[PDB]
């Protein structure tokens, strides 16, 4: 509806090469009144 939102969690893990089987919910974080057409996104890792 023209508003962009973020939710997050951080947690400690000990698994070598795959996403850990378990359950935990994410809290909300931000709201951003951008009002723009988004159809794609792109991640910035550092080199």
């Amino acid at each position: 509806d023209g508003y962009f939102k973020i939710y997050s969690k951080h947690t400690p893990i000990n698994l070598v090469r795959d996403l850990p089987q378990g359950f935990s919910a994410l809290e909300p974080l931000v709201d951003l009144p951008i009002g723009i057409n988004i159809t794609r996104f792109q991640t910035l890792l550092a080199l």
Binding site: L32, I36, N37, I38, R40, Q42, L44, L45, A46, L47
Partner: protein
């Protein structure tokens, strides 16, 4: 190693677009007519 994201629909200054980035001094969030790099990333000097 993750720092953030682009979001948009043309990414080459034809339509306004969103930049989100957690850089070494602060987070920045900005909505502008950006011309993005062909391969956006944040470069780090790391020498021995």
């Amino acid at each position: 190693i993750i720092r953030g994201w682009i979001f948009g629909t043309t990414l080459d200054s034809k339509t306004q677009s969103l930049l989100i980035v957690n850089n070494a001094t602060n987070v920045v969030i900005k909505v502008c007519e950006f011309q993005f790099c062909n391969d956006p990333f944040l470069g780090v000097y790391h020498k021995n």
